[PDB]
RNA sequence: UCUGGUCAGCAUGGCCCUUACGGCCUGGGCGACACACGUGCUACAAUGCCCACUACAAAGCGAUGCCACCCGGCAACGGGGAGC
RNA sequence: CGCGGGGUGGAGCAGCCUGGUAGCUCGUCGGGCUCAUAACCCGAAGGUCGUCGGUUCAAAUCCGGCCCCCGCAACCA
RNA sequence: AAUGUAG
């Protein structure tokens, strides 16, 4: 959830991007 | 004070004193002995007293070897009581001593100090004593 | 340690990281708006004297 | 279905089953399924004896893996008993090694609360 | 009203330090940890969780700045580079 | 000396005639309630069973030995 | 359903 840094919502809540949240 | 750590039995019969010493009759350790000239029970308090005097004399000096050990219990009924009603309570302990037993022994000392020390001790003992050397006490081959 | 501080903040020697902000009226270092250059007290006190152009009491 | 030593998944979709290995998570899983070319929606229940060997080939050979992976990290924590780095301690006192607030939490590295206290204030 | 808070934002009566209670710097500390309390965040799951596709906001903010868009990289980010 | 009783968490008492589970009340600690302190509520901690042996597979318990504390008896003369 | 140190 809102802290699983390996996820959609994990990056969202943190406000950063990576593999698990592709930058555009 | 000076007693066994355990005994098989707490009280024991008085018995007797046939002559001789059986053993413990020759020197073996130190270079001067105090020997018994009469049988007796010697009490721990006497042994100790003598021993202390020995040391006190050649204060903290040589070595001492106490060759009798009070294993025998010494009973005594309460004061003022009449006869019967079992054996008495144990008051102390004795060492059975018989003529020619080498009770003490000393090492690392002058003959003068030794001679004297022992004499002194002989006084604390309730029997007659003699001083000894290291003669034909060498039971070897 | 006030005065010597406000004077050390003036000059920009040594490693640009250290070039921190410092209130202009007040000796202040914490809670200074880069825009005004002023402490949050400093600010609010001037505001009230009109001495800040176009700067008004908000109300929405 | 005993790929890694004491480890055996079954009757679950293989994709996450492989998670049930120390040294294997969602990543090293998917990575291996394309390379073995097997549908992960399929269960450990059902597959060729060839599929099985094909999978254990790729995995056990590539990386490691319970046992000597587990045994490896330990020797690294062990080596921080050199002359004794900062990360060496914290391992020595079982405290957070990664720069944190001990004053409050840390309970994950510290076994539940040893309340133990007897502090005083005014009687008279 | 609370001899409420603030002399440590600043001001200020007095007291006190004036090769130091001033001043310069390196390094540390303020981040310590057997514990306890406050304000909080994330959860314990199926009215859920995950992955692919697709919509509808407002209020702000931006030049030794926000970065379109291309390219390297799993990605953080790093090269190029249009507009402001 | 002569008999008989006791010794267990910090206090006061169970458990021992009927070996295998140390229980209870108060108190202590941590958290609640109060502006605060009692009272009350929640949850914990704490005993080498005076002591050394013996029996038993196993001893607070059964068996002795020493160390303490309390109770009775000491009459006919 | 007790209590609240001196000035």
Quick gist of this model?
Chain D: It comes from Thermus thermophilus (strain ATCC 27634 / DSM 579 / HB8). This is part of a larger assembly, with chains A (24 residues), B (141 residues), C (60 residues) and D (124 residues). Chain C is mainly α and 60 residues long.
Question: What features would you describe in this structure?
Answer:
This is part of a larger assembly, with chains A (24 residues), B (141 residues), C (60 residues) and D (124 residues). By secondary structure, chain A is mainly α. Chain A has one helix at residues 8-14. Chain A is globular and about 20 Å long. Chain B has 141 residues and is of the alpha+beta class. Chain B has one domain: Aldehyde Oxidoreductase, domain 3 (Alpha-Beta Complex). Chain B has helices at residues 44-57, 111-124, and strands at 32-36, 40-43, 63-64, 72-76, 89-97, 102-107, 129-132. Chain D has 124 residues and is an all-alpha fold. Chain D has helices at 14-17, 26-35, 49-62, 70-79, 88-91. Chain D is elongated, with a radius of gyration of 23 Å. Chain D binds 3 RNA strands through residues 27, 95, 99-104, 106, 110, 113-119, 124. Chain A: Belongs to the bacterial ribosomal protein bTHX family. Chain A: Residues 1-24 are annotated as: Disordered.
- Radius of gyration of chain A, in Å, reads 7 Å
Measured between the Cα atoms of the first and last residue of chain A, the distance is: 22 Å
> Beta-sheet strand percentage of chain C?
5-15%
**Order of helix and strand elements from N to C terminus of chain C:** HEEH
CATH architectural group of chain C: Irregular
* CATH class assignment of chain C: Few Secondary Structures
The quaternary structure here is part of a larger assembly
Q: Roughly how much helix do the residues of chain A carry, as a percent range?
A: 25-40%
Strand content of chain A: under 5%
Radius of gyration of chain C: 14 Å
Structural class by helix and strand composition of chain C: mainly alpha
- CATH homolog superfamily of chain C: Ribosomal Protein S14/S29
Q: State the order of secondary-structure elements of chain A, H for helix, E for strand.
A: H
Family (chain D): Belongs to the universal ribosomal protein uS13 family.
Subunit structure (chain D): Part of the 30S ribosomal subunit. Forms a loose heterodimer with protein S19. Forms two bridges to the 50S subunit in the 70S ribosome, contacting protein L5 and the 23S rRNA; these bridges are straddled by the 5S rRNA.
Protein name (chain D): Small ribosomal subunit protein uS13
GO molecular function (chain D): rRNA binding; structural constituent of ribosome; tRNA binding
């Amino acid at each position: 959830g809102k802290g699983d840094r390996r996820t959609r919502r994990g990056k969202i809540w943190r406000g950063t991007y990576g593999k698990y949240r592709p930058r555009k | 004070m000076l007693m066994p750590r355990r005994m098989k039995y707490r009280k024991q019969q008085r018995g007797r004193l046939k002559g001789a010493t059986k053993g413990g009759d020759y020197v073996a350790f130190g270079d001067y002995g105090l020997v018994a000239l009469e049988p007796a029970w010697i009490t721990a308090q006497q042994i100790e007293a003598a021993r202390v005097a020995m040391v006190r004399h050649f204060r903290r000096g040589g070595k001492i070897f106490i060759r009798i050990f009070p294993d025998k219990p010494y009973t005594k009924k309460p004061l003022e009581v009449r006869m019967g009603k079992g054996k008495g309570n144990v008051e102390g302990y004795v060492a059975v001593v018989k003529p020619g037993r080498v009770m003490f022994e000393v090492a690392g000392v002058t003959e003068e100090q030794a001679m004297e020390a022992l004499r002194i001790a002989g006084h604390k003992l309730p029997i007659k004593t003699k001083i000894v050397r290291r003669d034909a006490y060498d039971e070897a081959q | 340690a006030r005065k010597a501080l406000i004077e050390k903040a003036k000059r920009t020697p040594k490693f640009k990281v250290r070039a921190y902000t410092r209130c202009v009226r007040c000796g202040r270092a914490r809670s200074v708006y880069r825009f005004f250059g002023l402490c949050r007290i400093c600010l609010r006190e001037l505001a009230h004297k009109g001495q800040l152009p176009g700067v008004r009491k908000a109300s929405w | 279905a005993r790929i890694a030593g004491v480890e055996i998944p079954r009757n679950k979709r293989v994709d996450v089953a492989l998670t049930y290995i120390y040294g294997i998570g969602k990543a090293r899983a998917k990575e291996a399924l394309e390379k073995t070319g097997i549908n992960p929606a399929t269960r450990v229940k059902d597959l060729t004896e060839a599929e099985v060997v094909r999978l254990r080939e790729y995995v056990e050979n590539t990386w490691k893996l319970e046992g000597e992976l587990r045994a490896e990290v330990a020797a690294n924590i062990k080596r921080l008993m050199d002359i004794g780095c900062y990360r060496g301690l914290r391992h020595r006192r079982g405290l957070p090694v990664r720069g944190q607030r001990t004053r409050t939490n840390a309970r994950t590295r510290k076994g539940p609360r040893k309340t133990v206290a007897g502090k005083k204030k005014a009687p008279r």
